[model samples]
Each structure stands twice: as C-alpha cells, then as structure tokens.
Target: TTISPHDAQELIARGAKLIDIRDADEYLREHIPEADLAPLSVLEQSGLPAKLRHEQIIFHDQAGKRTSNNADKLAAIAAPAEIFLLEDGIDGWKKAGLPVAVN
Candidate 1:
C-alpha cells in the first residue's frame, strides 16, 4: 500500500521500521533520517535481519517508481509483517518537509 511521509512517520514513531531500498551509492548521498539501508541486492542475498520484531515496515526509493514496482518482492521478504511504500519515496518525504541525513 501507499503511505505519505507524515503517516509513515507516525507509524515509525510507534515502532514501525523504515527501510530504504536503494543501493549504497544513492543511499550514501542522502536518505530519510529514520531510514535504514536494506539495499535490494542485500535483501535478495539475505532478507531482513531475523525478526527485528518491528511490526510495521515502510519502504522507499528515490522516487518510488522502483519501490512501487518492487513492492510485492519486498512484501514477500517482509513476510508476516505489515508493509507499505512511500507515496513518492524519499522525494515525497523531502517534499513533506521532513529531515534527511547525509554522510
């Protein structure tokens, strides 16, 4: 399902996990402060860390095109957990005036 940044933040505050699916290059450039990198390749290689115990998960990419397209795969990997995609990925989060961090 699609979710807005504010809404996603609400769930995130309540224990939801925010995951950014972009590769290391883009992620290293910038990303939502709350997001943790789960590069698509790494995911395929290993999947979410065994039971982080976080109930809900929100996935995002640069513009959501990729995230939306791969939604099902990510959901499958998130098995047994509630999941959602950023309405417009990190773009939407930035548009929503949220903070992003850079390394």
Candidate 2:
C-alpha cells in the first residue's frame, strides 16, 4: 500500500514502525526520528525489533529509490506486517513540509 508523508507521520505518531532501508551511513546521517535502520541489502538477515513484526511497516529511501525492493524483502519473510511505502519517499516527506532530522 502507499502512504503519503502526512499519513505516514500520523501513523508513526500513533505507533507505527518507520523503517529506513538506506545504508548505515545514510541512516546515521539523516532519517525520520524513531525510525529503524534495516538496510535492504540484509533486511532478511537483520534482526528487527520484535514488537514491530505486528506493526505497520512504513518504508523510506533516498529519493524513494529502493522502497519497493525492501517491501519485497519483507514480503518474502512473510512478516505478518502491513507494508506502507512512502509515496514520495524522504524527498516527498520534505516536499510535504514535514520535519527531517540530520544526526
């Protein structure tokens, strides 16, 4: 499913899990606060937070490049989680006038 930045923000505020599939460096540099870093390269292998397995999966990528890829990976895992790709990614989030933090 697709979610706009505003919707994503609302869902997250209500306790959704925002997963950033970008690499560690990119994630460390900037990401939505409270988001989890699960690089697409090793999403299946990476240890995800247990509570998130039953939560909404809100994915974001640089320019929205790999949102689908990561979603597919999660699907492969049969994660029993609902996946929601940011319709326009981080760029979209910014374009929507949402706040972004750089660490």
Candidate 3:
C-alpha cells in the first residue's frame, strides 16, 4: 500500500528509516531527513539493509516506479518485511504541499 507523508512522518518519529531509491544525484538535490540512499542499482547488487532485516523499510523513488521495482528485488534477498511505497513519491510529497529539504 502507498503511504502518505503524514504517515511517513509518524514512522520517522518512531525511528523507522526512510530510503530513497533514486540515484545519488537526484537525492543530493533534495531528500527527507535520515533517509538512506539506496539507489536501485545498489540494492540490486548489495541487497537491502543488513542489520534491519526484520525491521520496517520504506522505499521512495523519483516517481515510485523504481521503488516498486526495488521492492521485488529486496524480497528476493531477505524474509518479507514491511515495505511501503510513497504514494506519489517526491512528486506526491511536493504536490501534497509537504516540506522538502535540499542539499
């Protein structure tokens, strides 16, 4: 299911990590706080988070296309965990009038 920014905010408050599946260049342009950069290329090769195999993982991409693609890849590597896609991705977040940080 797709997660809203409000819901994502709650997850962050509870210590869940947000992952950006976009390329490093896109991420450096803008991203959420504490969001780990895991481009689909990296996840496909290196796999998902090592220490958080059983923890919740949320994946966000430029437009959610890559996020869905990566989710399938991640499922192949580890036991199923909570993986969510941001409904509209960064576009949705921005369109929803949510704040974003740029580096």
Query: For residues 1-103, what per-residue lDDT tens digits would candidate 1 score against the true structure?
Result: 8999999999998989998889888988998888888888888788889644377988889998998778778888887889888999898998999999878
Against the true structure, what is each candidate's TM-score? 0.92, 0.83, 0.82
The top-ranked prediction according to lDDT is 1
RMSD of 3: 2.1
Q: How would you encode candidate 2's per-residue C-alpha lDDT over 3-93 as one tens digit per residue?
A: 9998888888888888777889987787777677777776667656575564677878887767765566656543677778888778888
Q: lDDT of each prediction vs. the true structure?
A: 0.87, 0.76, 0.73
- How big is the positional error of residue 24 in model 3, measured in Å on the Cα after superposition? 0.8
RMSD of each: 1.3, 2.0, 2.1
Total backbone collisions, model 1? 0
Badly placed stretches (over 4 Å) of model 1 are 51-53
Clashing pairs in 3: none
Instruction: List the lowest-lDDT window of 10 residues for candidate 2.
Output: 69-78
| Structure candidate 1, residue pairs in collision | none
- TM-score, prediction 1: 0.92
Global Cα lDDT for candidate 1: 0.87
